[PDB]
Amino acid sequence: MEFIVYLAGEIHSNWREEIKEKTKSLKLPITFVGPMENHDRSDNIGEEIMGVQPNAVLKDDKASDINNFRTAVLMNKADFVIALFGEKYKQWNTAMDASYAIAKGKPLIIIRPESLHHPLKELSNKANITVETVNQAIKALSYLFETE
Amino acid sequence: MEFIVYLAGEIHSNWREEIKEKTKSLKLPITFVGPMENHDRSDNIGEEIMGVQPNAVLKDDKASDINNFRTAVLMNKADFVIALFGEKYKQWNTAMDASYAIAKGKPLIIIRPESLHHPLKELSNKANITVETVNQAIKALSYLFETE
Amino acid sequence: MEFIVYLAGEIHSNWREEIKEKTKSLKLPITFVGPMENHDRSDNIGEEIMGVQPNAVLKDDKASDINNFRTAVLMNKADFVIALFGEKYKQWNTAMDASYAIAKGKPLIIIRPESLHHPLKELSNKANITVETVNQAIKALSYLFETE
Amino acid sequence: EFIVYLAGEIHSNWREEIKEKTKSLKLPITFVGPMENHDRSDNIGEEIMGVQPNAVLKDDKASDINNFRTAVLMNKADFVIALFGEKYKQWNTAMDASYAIAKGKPLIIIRPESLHHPLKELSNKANITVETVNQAIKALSYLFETE
Amino acid sequence: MEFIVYLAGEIHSNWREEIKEKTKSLKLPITFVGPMENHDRSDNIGEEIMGVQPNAVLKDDKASDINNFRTAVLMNKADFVIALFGEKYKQWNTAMDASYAIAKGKPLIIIRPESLHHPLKELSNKANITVETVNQAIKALSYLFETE
Amino acid sequence: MEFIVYLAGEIHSNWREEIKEKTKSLKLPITFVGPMENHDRSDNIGEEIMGVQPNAVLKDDKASDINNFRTAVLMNKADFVIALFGEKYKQWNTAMDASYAIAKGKPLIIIRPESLHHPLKELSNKANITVETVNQAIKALSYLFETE
Amino acid sequence: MEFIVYLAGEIHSNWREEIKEKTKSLKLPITFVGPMENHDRSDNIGEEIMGVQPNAVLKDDKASDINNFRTAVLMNKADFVIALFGEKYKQWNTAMDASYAIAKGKPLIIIRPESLHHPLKELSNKANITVETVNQAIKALSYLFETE
Amino acid sequence: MEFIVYLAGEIHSNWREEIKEKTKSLKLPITFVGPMENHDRSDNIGEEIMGVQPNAVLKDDKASDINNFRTAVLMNKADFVIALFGEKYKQWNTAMDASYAIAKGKPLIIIRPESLHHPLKELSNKANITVETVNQAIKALSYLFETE
């Protein structure tokens, strides 16, 4: 069968592309989905679609109307979820998608550097797998389909 | 990936054909489903399948037997829902479909003229996206498959 | 045992007090919950908590945050739902709540005048019981506990 | 009776304000939440199952117990109040609010307007986003108000 | 710890009194609920509330609106179900309720005379316990609370 | 837009082939599933697989182990259900399958002669559509994909 | 608030009594439920209630009808579960109950000696808490109500 | 119409390839999934992905992070489950996956020697089908698709 996998995380690095390229090398039957990766497009889609809001709290809420729509639709298609944390930014959006995955019973892989273990401890304790590198998560993905 | 989208709303006007045409113009992988769009067919289907009924309430209730079957079966295929409100007709069928999507965790876009913001304020507050025109909806549909 | 019943509908008339009085007159083990029945309080609760807003759509949305929080919390306590429709106002909020109850499997009584049956036909077809008056709904409530 | 989970950082005593103000109004709400003693909460893992080979494992075994307690009390809660501050990563707070949204429990978020952007997706999914406890209390009183 | 138990079956005889009597002799913490047991009232309750119907099919459907509302509400309170089949009548309603219990994860005891084993074979195979008499179902209920 | 449909009802006669042929002629995107239609094989599959049993109850229960396995696996594939009742045989299995469909939210069509309206009143009341004939059911299936 | 806790594990010893007294000593708001603790009674209840059976397998199956009924009813009351494994007996029933609690979202504490960690690795990995002793379990229970 | 079937059981023997070969010879539309069948790979996958662990308990728990991830992901894909028990090894993981199938509504065939009926009585009572051999289980699989 084929798998759909949601990639939750901060869009500022190209961590997702790397996942997508190493997976294709191994020819795994996995299709990845996730949020809009352009940070500028993502912050402004609210005004782009529903007109320039007067204040900044309304500009973000309008953009979140659209981005939460995209996330809900793709998450509903996702068989399981991979969420990556990094040392920069609040990343409450990432914790939200990860916790959503767990709450809905979608298996979750968390990718995180060990130096962030303490603030992630409740979330990683709930995850199926916590690793520190994309390379480790790839090995977990390969093991899904291996025969020996 | 393919998506199935239920178009909820009044069948008196031909608003769904704008949505279908435009979406196909962008080649989004979206199949639309919805109610029987022929108002005279839809009102009379109960008496067409079963016979003429003793009175008007029972003519509507039999047509509803058939129409609520169609909408349940298609809505069960639907990944998300778009519901449009116009300024004519009671449209409690439209509110019932929108609120159903919400209740079942299907993402919901509402289309409604700003002039109807107050009678819809509870329902738009619960939907994922509330816009004013079909073109604004199309933009949100495209943002689902956009890379930038 | 005890039952919690959500009375959904127009807060412009006083049908709810009629249901509560006749239920207490029969001494049924039923408690009634429902929305804020003061329309001006309800329309304005958003500004009363979160301060006055830049426009009327935003003022209505903020009031809907609070009123949908009260509705959600109280619906989650309701064993079943009575929804009354009247001749005046869109009542898209009434259709919403009744549809919510159907979608969640909460038994539902609709009270509606025969003259609105056609616009309510799909929704009434889905409810457990549709009746024209409050006295009728009270007889179904009483039948719940009757022994002969 | 309503059981309400208070989610958020345990370093400060914001929960103490809500409980006191809610009791003044005589609202029929009973409050539940995590262990509020931070040192207890960080060491409960080692307290029950013994010292761990490293810090990660120390934090993991503590999460067994703390995630047990939260699951159990969350399962009793009718709805949730999550508070965010300017201090700490607060990923546990975001986890609990998201969990409430996923399970259809209504959610109030208390958060200062300065944190509006990092919280944008989360507050968008909450029922109510307010800035102060006093506003949350008004939403709560409104649950039982008649006029 | 108390339990609510729905007693589904033909109302045409008095098996439910035997169950309630023997349970109270044992002082078990169980409250029973069930359909209206006066057959003529149950048949006529549709017209009692919504007036004489145009034909017998409509008279039975209106009665079914009310009896199924009563069944849904009481069933929603019940922790588990006891369903009794006898030799008289079609009893398609009894199989409906028993099957409803199974589908909803409600433990089910079926009481049926061995004479009826073959037409009941699929249903009794899905029930937790299938016995021949009320006394056997009573011993099941006692075993729930026993200590040795 | 393919639909799997479970055909519940007595296996002694050949009503399913008429539905299957008439559907294929109209070219509807529907595949049908159902129980083993050979009555002798269906009564004996318990003893064929699990071996000769000591008595006729055990023979019927082992047959039901297998038949309820097949019904559950195919029911789980099914988008909706057609259940047909006739005048011969108990048909408690038909009531079981139809009630299961309704409990799990599968839309349901009941086909039953008007002379059986009374014993089936609760069950037809819960079904989406209750018709008298196979050709009526087909008209409802056609309506699913009709555009005008 | 009250908590109901299912105690799963072998019925050959009296480890449950240790849990019940130490929890009583501490005055925790916890009521414990569990299977019939008398093995001879537990093994023969099938024959006690239904006939003596043709063979050992049917004796065990009939006993399990009643025991799985008690388990399902009591489990349905339980907020969470404690399962204890020991060095004797197959204890597949124990693994059953623990897996069921995991699968239904019921928090689960597992007590197992370190010598059984390898054969229990999958199950303990899924549990909320794995400890070696009853005393460790009681510390987890007390942490539920502790204020410092 | 195709089915995915999880093969739960001990990964020391090759019982599974017997099921897969005979199924293929019969050309049934069934694709089988299951855990990693190589025992040494399975025990060490935790250290292989995540590094050598401080002790055997942690080596087993890291392996179980990975193995339970595989099991959750494939089980979410499975329509039904076949579990085989033999006389060797603790097989609590087999009981775990079998109970999981029951708890999630996935149909279940258990294969177990009659000599193990007593320790398996509760689990076997809840399975759809319990047989002694792979050949009997194949007769059940084939009955699923049979026309006579």
Side-chain angles (χ1 to χ4, degrees), chain A residues 1-87 89-147, chain B residues 1-23 25-148, chain C, chain D residues 1-22 24-147, chain E residues 1-147, chain F residues 1-23 25-148, chain G residues 1-26 28-148, chain H:
Chain A
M1 47 282 273
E2 310 254 353
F3 294 88
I4 309 199
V5 176
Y6 191 98
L7 302 174
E10 50 77 36
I11 49 194
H12 294 122
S13 60
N14 304 10
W15 70 265
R16 282 188 191 72
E17 185 53 72
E18 159 179 30
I19 281 137
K20 291 149 183 251
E21 322 145 304
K22 281 158 163 153
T23 305
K24 189 160 172 184
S25 288
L26 307 171
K27 309 246 163 263
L28 305 179
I30 294 175
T31 301
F32 294 99
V33 289
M36 164 60 81
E37 296 184 37
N38 189 284
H39 174 91
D40 280 302
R41 190 80 200 289
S42 173
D43 304 291
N44 287 294
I45 186 67
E47 305 202 302
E48 181 195 321
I49 296 208
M50 293 183 270
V52 47
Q53 301 303 294
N55 72 54
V57 173
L58 254 298
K59 160 179 173 167
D60 291 340
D61 200 52
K62 281 310 163 263
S64 300
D65 279 348
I66 314 284
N67 288 305
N68 288 338
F69 176 76
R70 184 175 155 143
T71 295
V73 167
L74 297 182
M75 257 306 180
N76 279 339
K77 283 291 181 209
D79 296 295
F80 63 88
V81 178
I82 299 179
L84 177 145
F85 287 89
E87 292 185 335
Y89 318 142
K90 293 300 188 309
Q91 298 166 107
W92 286 325
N93 62 319
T94 307
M96 188 204 36
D97 295 354
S99 187
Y100 179 91
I102 290 153
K104 288 298 195 198
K106 304 178 182 284
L108 178 69
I109 298 176
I110 279 193
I111 281 165
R112 66 109 180 72
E114 271 214 351
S115 71
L116 293 180
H117 91 248
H118 191 269
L120 285 172
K121 58 183 208 265
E122 289 95 353
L123 196 53
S124 79
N125 177 267
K126 296 317 284 166
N128 294 82
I129 306 176
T130 303
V131 297
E132 304 81 51
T133 67
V134 178
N135 289 312
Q136 292 171 307
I138 295 287
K139 281 150 118 193
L141 294 173
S142 167
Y143 187 68
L144 222 48
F145 312 102
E146 298 149 349
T147 52
Chain B
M1 53 204 63
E2 322 77 314
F3 292 103
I4 289 181
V5 181
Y6 190 94
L7 302 179
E10 48 109 357
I11 52 171
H12 305 81
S13 146
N14 222 43
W15 66 266
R16 296 180 176 66
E17 224 89 69
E18 195 196 333
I19 305 199
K20 287 165 207 163
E21 285 194 311
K22 301 190 164 166
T23 306
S25 297
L26 313 80
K27 197 134 37 153
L28 305 176
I30 295 185
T31 309
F32 296 99
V33 296
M36 155 66 63
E37 302 180 23
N38 191 285
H39 186 40
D40 174 278
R41 192 79 198 290
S42 166
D43 289 310
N44 288 287
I45 189 70
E47 290 192 336
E48 174 181 346
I49 291 158
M50 290 135 306
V52 159
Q53 295 302 326
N55 52 49
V57 166
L58 277 179
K59 175 191 184 190
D60 297 347
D61 197 40
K62 292 272 151 56
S64 287
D65 271 5
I66 313 296
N67 283 309
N68 283 341
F69 172 75
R70 176 176 166 141
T71 77
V73 166
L74 297 175
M75 185 75 81
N76 282 347
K77 284 294 183 190
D79 295 293
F80 58 97
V81 173
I82 300 169
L84 181 134
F85 288 85
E87 316 239 47
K88 318 279 172 332
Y89 308 133
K90 302 294 172 143
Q91 288 158 110
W92 293 321
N93 72 309
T94 314
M96 161 183 89
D97 286 350
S99 175
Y100 174 88
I102 292 158
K104 295 281 160 207
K106 298 180 186 281
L108 177 68
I109 299 165
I110 294 192
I111 303 169
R112 61 100 187 74
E114 196 140 281
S115 62
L116 288 192
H117 77 85
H118 189 87
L120 283 167
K121 61 180 174 132
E122 292 89 5
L123 198 50
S124 61
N125 181 254
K126 295 310 307 183
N128 290 77
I129 304 169
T130 297
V131 302
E132 316 107 44
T133 90
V134 160
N135 280 281
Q136 288 183 255
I138 296 296
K139 281 190 226 213
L141 293 190
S142 284
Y143 191 79
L144 229 59
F145 312 99
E146 266 161 2
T147 50
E148 63 218 64
Chain C
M1 56 231 96
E2 154 89 50
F3 293 93
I4 295 158
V5 176
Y6 191 97
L7 307 179
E10 52 107 338
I11 67 179
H12 83 238
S13 94
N14 309 297
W15 58 277
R16 289 190 182 72
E17 222 198 55
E18 190 191 344
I19 282 198
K20 302 190 271 213
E21 286 182 49
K22 296 179 153 140
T23 300
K24 288 206 19 153
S25 74
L26 299 166
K27 307 287 270 186
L28 305 185
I30 305 195
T31 298
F32 293 105
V33 289
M36 161 69 36
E37 295 164 18
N38 182 315
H39 193 215
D40 167 87
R41 193 81 191 301
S42 187
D43 277 3
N44 291 281
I45 184 56
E47 293 196 323
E48 180 193 327
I49 290 175
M50 266 159 294
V52 174
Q53 297 299 114
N55 58 60
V57 173
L58 294 164
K59 171 199 194 198
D60 281 358
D61 204 46
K62 295 294 154 243
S64 292
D65 280 346
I66 321 293
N67 287 310
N68 284 344
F69 170 83
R70 178 184 162 125
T71 283
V73 168
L74 291 178
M75 203 66 114
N76 285 344
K77 283 284 185 181
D79 301 309
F80 65 91
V81 179
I82 302 168
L84 183 139
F85 285 82
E87 292 281 359
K88 253 310 226 173
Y89 301 139
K90 295 302 181 323
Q91 309 152 60
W92 277 320
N93 67 319
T94 310
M96 194 174 81
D97 287 357
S99 186
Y100 178 87
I102 293 157
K104 294 305 204 167
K106 288 174 194 286
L108 166 66
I109 302 175
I110 292 181
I111 308 169
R112 64 105 181 72
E114 226 194 1
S115 58
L116 296 172
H117 180 66
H118 187 258
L120 282 162
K121 72 193 163 116
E122 290 94 359
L123 184 50
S124 150
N125 179 257
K126 291 312 301 159
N128 289 86
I129 304 182
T130 304
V131 289
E132 289 83 44
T133 65
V134 171
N135 279 351
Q136 294 174 295
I138 295 299
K139 288 166 154 213
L141 292 202
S142 201
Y143 187 78
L144 229 47
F145 317 104
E146 266 151 35
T147 72
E148 43 215 35
Chain D
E1 172 200 290
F2 289 85
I3 295 173
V4 177
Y5 192 94
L6 311 183
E9 40 84 359
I10 50 183
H11 293 103
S12 98
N13 65 116
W14 66 267
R15 286 177 187 73
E16 223 197 56
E17 193 196 346
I18 293 278
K19 300 189 204 183
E20 274 179 8
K21 291 177 169 201
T22 300
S24 325
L25 313 153
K26 274 174 64 203
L27 302 188
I29 300 148
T30 278
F31 288 117
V32 304
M35 166 63 81
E36 277 155 8
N37 179 323
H38 176 86
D39 268 46
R40 190 74 195 288
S41 161
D42 274 302
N43 288 320
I44 190 64
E46 299 203 326
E47 184 190 313
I48 300 160
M49 275 147 285
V51 156
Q52 290 306 118
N54 71 29
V56 163
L57 282 290
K58 176 182 190 213
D59 291 1
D60 199 51
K61 289 293 146 33
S63 292
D64 289 347
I65 315 297
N66 279 313
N67 284 350
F68 175 70
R69 167 184 173 137
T70 298
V72 168
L73 302 182
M74 191 69 87
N75 283 336
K76 291 292 204 190
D78 302 293
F79 62 91
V80 177
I81 306 170
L83 184 142
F84 291 85
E86 241 302 14
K87 274 142 262 203
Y88 317 117
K89 295 262 163 223
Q90 298 169 90
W91 286 323
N92 62 298
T93 311
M95 158 183 85
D96 289 350
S98 187
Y99 172 97
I101 293 149
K103 288 302 226 243
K105 289 178 203 289
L107 174 73
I108 302 176
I109 286 176
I110 307 160
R111 67 103 178 74
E113 271 221 344
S114 38
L115 299 172
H116 77 287
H117 191 82
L119 282 168
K120 61 178 159 138
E121 296 93 1
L122 194 47
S123 64
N124 183 257
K125 302 294 316 163
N127 295 81
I128 310 184
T129 307
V130 287
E131 286 73 30
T132 70
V133 158
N134 267 352
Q135 305 179 306
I137 310 329
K138 282 167 150 201
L140 294 189
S141 292
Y142 190 75
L143 229 52
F144 315 96
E145 271 158 17
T146 75
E147 46 278 344
Chain E
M1 215 171 45
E2 88 166 57
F3 299 84
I4 311 202
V5 177
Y6 189 101
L7 302 178
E10 43 74 28
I11 63 201
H12 271 217
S13 89
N14 255 267
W15 61 276
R16 287 186 189 74
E17 286 251 53
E18 179 178 8
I19 271 164
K20 285 167 90 32
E21 265 329 278
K22 293 185 145 147
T23 295
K24 225 182 145 183
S25 286
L26 287 155
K27 281 190 82 73
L28 308 190
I30 292 164
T31 297
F32 297 102
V33 295
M36 158 60 57
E37 292 177 42
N38 169 349
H39 177 89
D40 201 69
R41 187 83 195 293
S42 181
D43 281 338
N44 288 281
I45 191 63
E47 295 190 318
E48 185 156 2
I49 293 177
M50 272 153 306
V52 152
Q53 293 301 297
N55 58 51
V57 169
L58 296 166
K59 170 180 180 186
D60 293 7
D61 199 55
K62 281 326 181 253
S64 291
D65 287 336
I66 316 291
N67 285 307
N68 285 336
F69 170 78
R70 177 177 167 139
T71 287
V73 161
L74 297 175
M75 200 51 99
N76 283 345
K77 287 294 193 188
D79 302 292
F80 60 94
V81 182
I82 305 187
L84 183 144
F85 288 85
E87 325 254 11
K88 309 134 288 301
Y89 305 116
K90 290 289 185 297
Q91 291 168 97
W92 288 323
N93 55 356
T94 311
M96 177 190 186
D97 289 351
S99 180
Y100 177 95
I102 294 159
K104 290 307 184 76
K106 295 188 200 279
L108 171 72
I109 297 164
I110 294 192
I111 302 168
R112 59 109 188 70
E114 151 152 338
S115 73
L116 289 178
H117 78 272
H118 184 94
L120 277 172
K121 58 195 180 121
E122 292 96 4
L123 192 49
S124 87
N125 178 262
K126 288 326 271 143
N128 299 76
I129 307 179
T130 303
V131 294
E132 292 62 77
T133 65
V134 163
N135 278 327
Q136 283 167 298
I138 287 305
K139 295 165 83 123
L141 296 192
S142 287
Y143 188 77
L144 227 62
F145 312 99
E146 262 146 41
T147 62
Chain F
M1 233 42 87
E2 298 272 294
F3 295 88
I4 298 184
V5 174
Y6 192 92
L7 297 181
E10 50 91 1
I11 59 194
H12 298 79
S13 100
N14 201 9
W15 63 275
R16 294 185 175 72
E17 302 308 312
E18 180 188 343
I19 272 161
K20 291 177 198 160
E21 220 92 56
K22 289 170 164 170
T23 300
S25 298
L26 303 157
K27 302 278 181 263
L28 301 183
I30 295 175
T31 297
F32 297 96
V33 293
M36 155 66 63
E37 295 172 44
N38 181 288
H39 173 98
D40 188 52
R41 183 85 196 290
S42 179
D43 282 2
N44 288 288
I45 187 69
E47 274 185 341
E48 175 194 308
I49 300 171
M50 257 84 75
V52 180
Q53 292 298 304
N55 58 55
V57 178
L58 288 163
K59 172 175 188 184
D60 285 343
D61 196 44
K62 288 310 154 43
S64 302
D65 284 344
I66 314 296
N67 280 310
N68 287 344
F69 172 74
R70 176 168 161 148
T71 47
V73 170
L74 299 174
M75 206 33 96
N76 281 347
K77 284 289 173 194
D79 305 288
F80 61 95
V81 179
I82 303 169
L84 169 144
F85 287 86
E87 328 212 359
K88 190 38 55 213
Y89 312 119
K90 286 294 205 278
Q91 303 165 99
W92 288 323
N93 61 302
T94 315
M96 185 175 62
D97 287 354
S99 178
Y100 175 93
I102 283 166
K104 300 311 210 153
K106 300 170 192 291
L108 168 67
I109 294 181
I110 289 178
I111 300 158
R112 61 97 184 83
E114 191 169 274
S115 46
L116 288 173
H117 85 266
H118 185 79
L120 287 167
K121 64 198 181 113
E122 295 89 8
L123 189 55
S124 44
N125 177 256
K126 289 326 270 177
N128 291 78
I129 303 179
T130 308
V131 293
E132 277 89 32
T133 72
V134 162
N135 275 332
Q136 287 171 299
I138 300 293
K139 291 175 174 204
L141 299 174
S142 306
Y143 190 64
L144 279 190
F145 319 100
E146 286 185 314
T147 59
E148 31 179 16
Chain G
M1 36 188 183
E2 316 179 287
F3 287 97
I4 295 182
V5 178
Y6 193 99
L7 293 183
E10 43 98 11
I11 67 173
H12 263 299
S13 79
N14 64 5
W15 63 265
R16 285 179 184 80
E17 265 182 359
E18 192 189 338
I19 290 264
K20 283 150 102 163
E21 295 173 359
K22 283 172 170 156
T23 289
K24 212 194 184 210
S25 211
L26 280 275
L28 300 190
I30 299 185
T31 309
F32 291 97
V33 297
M36 167 54 75
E37 306 199 6
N38 183 290
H39 192 75
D40 175 275
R41 193 74 194 307
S42 185
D43 279 351
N44 297 283
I45 191 62
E47 292 200 313
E48 182 180 333
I49 295 191
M50 281 102 105
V52 58
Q53 294 300 297
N55 59 60
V57 172
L58 285 163
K59 169 176 180 170
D60 284 347
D61 199 41
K62 293 297 154 42
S64 299
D65 283 349
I66 317 297
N67 287 313
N68 285 331
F69 173 79
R70 175 170 163 144
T71 283
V73 164
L74 296 180
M75 197 63 93
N76 284 348
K77 282 292 183 185
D79 299 294
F80 60 94
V81 173
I82 302 159
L84 182 147
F85 291 81
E87 217 86 41
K88 309 158 298 143
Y89 314 100
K90 290 293 183 314
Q91 297 163 99
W92 284 321
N93 47 15
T94 307
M96 191 174 63
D97 294 345
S99 182
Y100 173 97
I102 287 151
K104 290 303 197 161
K106 277 189 214 282
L108 164 72
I109 287 166
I110 286 179
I111 308 158
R112 62 103 182 78
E114 205 137 82
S115 77
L116 292 176
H117 186 259
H118 185 232
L120 281 167
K121 53 183 172 127
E122 290 92 3
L123 202 45
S124 77
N125 180 256
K126 287 314 291 159
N128 282 74
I129 305 176
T130 310
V131 296
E132 292 77 32
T133 80
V134 162
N135 281 342
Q136 285 166 306
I138 304 283
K139 290 179 163 198
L141 290 190
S142 292
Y143 189 72
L144 277 197
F145 317 98
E146 256 146 38
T147 62
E148 37 162 74
Chain H
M1 194 165 66
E2 292 242 38
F3 296 88
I4 295 146
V5 178
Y6 191 96
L7 299 179
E10 46 86 11
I11 60 147
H12 286 97
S13 93
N14 215 23
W15 67 271
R16 283 189 185 67
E17 340 299 328
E18 179 185 7
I19 297 194
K20 301 195 242 173
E21 280 158 11
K22 289 179 172 169
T23 300
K24 190 174 307 133
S25 302
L26 290 174
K27 295 222 226 183
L28 307 188
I30 297 181
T31 291
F32 291 97
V33 294
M36 152 75 39
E37 288 180 55
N38 174 4
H39 171 88
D40 290 18
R41 193 78 194 291
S42 175
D43 271 337
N44 288 279
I45 195 58
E47 298 196 320
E48 172 186 333
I49 292 194
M50 326 216 63
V52 166
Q53 296 300 302
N55 54 46
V57 165
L58 294 165
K59 172 180 178 182
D60 293 338
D61 200 47
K62 290 301 159 199
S64 292
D65 284 340
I66 306 289
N67 284 315
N68 284 337
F69 176 80
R70 175 168 168 139
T71 284
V73 167
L74 297 172
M75 188 66 90
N76 285 346
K77 289 288 193 178
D79 303 295
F80 55 96
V81 180
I82 301 178
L84 178 139
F85 289 84
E87 265 134 11
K88 295 326 136 193
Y89 314 103
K90 278 306 185 309
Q91 292 166 97
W92 285 322
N93 48 346
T94 314
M96 173 171 90
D97 299 335
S99 188
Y100 177 88
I102 297 161
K104 290 292 184 194
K106 298 182 190 294
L108 174 68
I109 302 180
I110 282 176
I111 306 173
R112 58 101 189 78
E114 199 155 74
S115 64
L116 277 178
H117 77 259
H118 190 269
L120 283 170
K121 61 204 182 115
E122 293 96 11
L123 195 56
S124 153
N125 176 256
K126 303 303 292 156
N128 296 69
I129 295 167
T130 300
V131 292
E132 299 63 61
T133 64
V134 168
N135 283 330
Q136 284 165 296
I138 289 287
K139 288 198 208 93
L141 293 185
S142 149
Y143 189 74
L144 198 53
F145 310 102
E146 226 86 71
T147 75
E148 73 218 5

